Design a protein around this nucleic acid. Structure first.
Ligand code: K
Ligand code: K
Ligand code: MG
Ligand code: MG
Ligand code: MG
Ligand code: MG
Ligand code: MG
Ligand code: MG
Ligand code: MG
Ligand code: MG
Ligand code: MG
Ligand code: MG
Ligand code: MG
Ligand code: MG
Lengths: 248, 93, 97, 99, 76, 134
RNA sequence: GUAACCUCGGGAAAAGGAGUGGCUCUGACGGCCGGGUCAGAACUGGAACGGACGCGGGGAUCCCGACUGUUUACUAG
RNA sequence: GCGCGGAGAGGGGGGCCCGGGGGCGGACCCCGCGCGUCCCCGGCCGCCCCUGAAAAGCCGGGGGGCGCCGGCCGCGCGCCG
RNA sequence: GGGUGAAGACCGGGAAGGGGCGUGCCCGCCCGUCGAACGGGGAGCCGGCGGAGACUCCGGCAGGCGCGGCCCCCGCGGAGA
């Protein structure tokens, strides 16, 4: 046979993300001495649309603390943030929607977004439109805090990791049908080359393990083991069960 | 309702996609084409610009909101919870 | 004359936004082509995106120094309305602060 | 609990008042207002300016418990009102529910 | 090309800024028997139309030998 | 319940060429059909800067002061809590600001008066620049 | 003048009828002269007028695929 | 078609921009009228799980430091198609 | 700077990585005079002439950008826009 679609994707070429006309990487403000002691004030300048992304981005201007002038940031906007609003970051930031503060100072039961797994990594956990995390409990003896992820799993992170109050803006996007093939075309034209999708049973044996036969059908079981080598891992990988169980 | 009985704005689709999709689109599109009261000046001049971006045609203030509607119920619940938790802390410092 | 069709005046014939012409009659009873130059935008406010009064829509290099200025402390960077807010805001803040 | 609504109705019926921010500033500067009422969504910089001027003229300033739309309804009007100043209460108006 | 006024014509001729002066007699149409004075300068060509032929003689005689002079007087 | 626009008050210019500068009200005109106006005198340029080098010829120029006198709309002013006692009202009046030569004479007089007060270290707040962060 | 059926949006130009030239007139619609269009009448031609040109044949049903789209360049749309 | 107004409408009086037009020059200009076509521009409105390049270069403002900076008259503008 | 591979070669931010004014001081983390005869870009029109060239020649009338001489000035008006 020849190389499969999954094997060809990993080599780049016509399978790279289309990044032209993107505003940049969205991140929390970097951690420094000024906000390790007090608070730093900024102002929201604009709210913009990012190609490929479902959630809006906000441009926030802060004073420069190692010289003269100003510093421009790029945040993921929580719901309810408006142009001209002033926000704070630091150990002494107040509990308002746009503010950034460490999770140790956030009361249990609060909604947070753009949480950082390890201190000083600039956010990585709740970044897609409509998502949020919950602060569950604190442990002052070990200095660790428990959170609940959008998938429902529970994780322990250090109490010095920062987050933003609120939930990500743009919630409800997936409640509307795409309806037409032309809509999915535009959606994926803003992201990467991955659409439309040809079924494996509709191919010839030379280019997929599912192809061939006098009727269209999968010859064997579709569950493959975890240790299958790269050209073999197609179908359901290491599935614990299959079918529509119906219960919890 | 002089021209149609039930399709409403989904009359632009003819007969092409089925009943369930058309009903859901009726609800969502009615919501997303509407005019909303501005939280800063109490006027009904807020319109959608992009998926989660809403602008006021009077004061020119831009806000981050939901897709298809300015406010979402989870957001209201979250804001109320934050406001409650903020007062309890400030009483005892 | 019974024919009024012309020929292209540029190096190539591809019609981009910088290759627009209009037609005029010459003293020799001939139809000629003249370029239509792009009109630049005048300066716009920093705080708002509105246009600033008093400056024409020409590239600044072809204006005299007086023609590209406004007689006000922040003239040409912000409008009169935006300047009042900064003055009021700074005074009222520094009085309480 | 109590209604400051009776006072507004009587002032609107027999008194003298002005609706708007420009008229309010022109009156307060001149020492002609007896009370300034303000909504809770008035823009902050106008709030500061009007407060400071009232301080410089020893004028009483109060805040209303609604939005400019609510105040406009409470004065019998169909538009928003951010600042109201009463120049002369009426013989039926007891400007003693606020001050 | 630009129009010039009478007073700053012989002034320019005074500062020796004109390079040549041409006199042309117009006698058809809205140019009814009037004359046009065209002065060649370093930057521009300046033209004045005296309302009557007589005024031409005085001014030109007021700058004779100060700037070289031509005549046209087309009669066709 | 007391009017606040009275001679001797210190305001701030909000509009025009001299916006953002401080001034003193010398005469409040009576309300007419054009609105409310007043006559003010304000600092047009502050005394520059002088340092340890002390080069006298340039020092005198650097220490010079300018001022403006004119009537202006009372809507274009921000009254303050400060005061500045003076007596300019004798040579300052409506008819003495309409003509030009009188205006120039008044301007030099006010310039000389301001220079003194600056030297003797009085009225520090009035003779200071209002920071603006546009 | 238009049926069954229908996801109530369609089906639908459904099906199916009648008129249309030339000449001489009448009315309607603007502005402080202009313009075309729409409507009506008499007369008159081998019972003829979308006079060349340009320009749907229709209906009743069954099977397959929902639909617009793509495909074996040179025998399969 | 819309849209706007106490965060200031209508009215009266003004300022700014407008790839344009008229007059006089260039140059001793037959006179009026009108429907349509093409191109460009303008203010609105509509659409998107699609938001519709960048840099050289040029200019302005704040603060600081410095000082003729314009007018007239002369010259010049290389390489390659 | 380097890293890797028997090499050819391929991969690459962690490296004491430049200027100015003018001689002493001051400023400064780190590539490209590569890649568009359709994108950006300081400025051109008319008349005439040959056998074969013209927005290029000649006549006229203009624009832009520099350099050199002579005179040659460090802001006033408005109520406000
Ligand atoms: K599939
Ligand atoms: K090129
Ligand atoms: Mg096959
Ligand atoms: Mg195989
Ligand atoms: Mg088969
Ligand atoms: Mg101007
Ligand atoms: Mg099909
Ligand atoms: Mg088809
Ligand atoms: Mg074939
Ligand atoms: Mg075939
Ligand atoms: Mg290149
Ligand atoms: Mg080009
Ligand atoms: Mg030439
Ligand atoms: Mg040829």
């Amino acid at each position: 046979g020849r190389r499969i679609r999954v094997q060809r994707k990993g080599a780049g070429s016509v399978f790279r993300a289309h990044v032209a006309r993107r505003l940049g990487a969205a991140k929390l403000r970097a951690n420094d001495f000024a906000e390790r002691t007090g608070s730093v004030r900024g102002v929201v300048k604009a709210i913009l649309h990012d190609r490929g992304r479902g959630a809006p981005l906000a441009r926030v201007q802060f004073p420069n603390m190692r010289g003269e002038g100003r510093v421009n940031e790029l945040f993921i906007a929580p719901e309810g943030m408006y142009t001209g609003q002033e926000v704070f970051s630091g150990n002494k930031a107040t509990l308002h929607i746009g503010n950034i503060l460490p999770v140790g100072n956030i009361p249990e039961g609060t909604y947070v977004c753009n949480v950082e797994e390890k201190p000083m990594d600039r956010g990585c956990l709740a970044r897609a439109s409509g998502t949020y995390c919950l602060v569950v409990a604190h442990n002052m003896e070990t200095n660790k805090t428990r959170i609940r992820l959008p998938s429902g799993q529970k994780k322990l992170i250090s109490s010095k990791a920062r987050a933003m109050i609120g939930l990500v803006a743009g919630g409800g996007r997936t409640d509307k049908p795409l309806l037409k093939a032309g809509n999915a075309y535009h959606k994926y034209k803003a992201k990467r080359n991955c659409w439309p999708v040809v079924r494996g049973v509709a191919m010839n044996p030379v280019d997929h393990p599912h192809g061939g036969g006098n009727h269209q059908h999968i010859g064997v079981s579709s569950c493959v083991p975890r240790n299958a080598v790269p050209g073999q891992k197609v179908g359901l990988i290491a599935a614990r069960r299959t079918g529509c169980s119906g219960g919890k | 309702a002089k021209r149609t009985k039930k399709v409403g704005l989904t009359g632009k689709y003819g007969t092409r996609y089925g009943r369930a999709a058309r009903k859901q689109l009726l609800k969502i599109e009615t919501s997303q084409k509407a005019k909303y009261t501005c939280p800063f000046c109490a006027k009904d001049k807020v319109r959608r610009t992009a998926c989660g971006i809403w602008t006021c045609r009077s004061c020119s203030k831009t806000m981050a909101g939901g897709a298809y509607s300015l406010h979402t119920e989870p957001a209201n619940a979250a804001r109320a919870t934050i406001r409650r938790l903020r007062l309890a802390r400030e009483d005892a410092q | 004359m019974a024919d009024c069709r012309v020929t292209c005046r540029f190096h190539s014939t591809y019609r981009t936004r910088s290759k627009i012409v209009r037609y005029k009659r010459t003293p020799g009873n001939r139809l000629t082509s003249l370029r239509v130059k792009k009109l630049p935008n005048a300066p716009h406010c920093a705080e708002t995106g509105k246009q600033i009064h008093g400056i024409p829509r020409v590239i600044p290099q072809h204006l005299t120094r007086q023609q590209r200025k406004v007689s006000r402390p922040y003239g040409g960077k912000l409008c009169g309305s935006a300047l009042r807010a900064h003055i009021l805001e700074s005074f009222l803040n520094e009085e309480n602060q | 609990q109590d209604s400051i609504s009776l006072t507004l109705t009587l002032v609107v019926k027999s008194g003298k008042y002005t609706l708007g921010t420009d008229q309010a500033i022109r009156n307060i500067r001149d020492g002609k207002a007896q009370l300034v009422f303000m909504a809770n969504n008035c823009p902050p910089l106008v709030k500061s300016q009007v407060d400071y001027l009232c301080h410089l003229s020893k004028t009483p300033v109060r805040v209303f418990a609604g939005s400019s739309r609510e105040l406009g309804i409470a004065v019998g009007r169909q538009f928003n009102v951010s600042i109201m100043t009463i120049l002369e209460a009426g013989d039926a108006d007891l400007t003693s529910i606020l001050g | 090309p630009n129009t010039i006024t009478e007073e700053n014509l012989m002034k320019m001729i005074a500062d020796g800024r004109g390079k040549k002066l041409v006199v042309k007699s117009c006698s058809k149409g809205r140019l009814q028997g009037k004359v046009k004075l065209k002065l060649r300068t370093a930057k521009y060509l300046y033209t004045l139309t005296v309302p009557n032929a007589d005024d031409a003689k005085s001014i030109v005689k007021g700058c004779k030998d100060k700037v070289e002079v031509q005549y046209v007087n087309d009669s066709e | 319940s007391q009017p606040i626009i009275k001679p001797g008050l210190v305001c701030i210019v909000l509009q025009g060429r001299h916006a953002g500068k401080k001034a003193v009200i010398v005469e409040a005109l009576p309300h007419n059909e054009r609105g409310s106006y007043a006559i003010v005198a304000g600092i047009a340029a502050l005394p520059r800067r002088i340092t340890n080098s002390m080069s006298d010829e340039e020092a005198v120029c650097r220490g010079r002061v300018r001022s403006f006198v004119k009537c202006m709309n009372v809507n274009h002013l921000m009254p303050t809590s400060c005061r500045l006692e003076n007596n300019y009202k004798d040579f300052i009046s409506t008819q003495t600001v309409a003509d030009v030569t009188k205006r120039r004479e008044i301007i030099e007089t006010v310039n000389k008066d301001f220079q003194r007060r600056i030297l003797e270290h009085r009225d520090t707040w009035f003779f200071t620049k209002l920071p603006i962060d546009a």
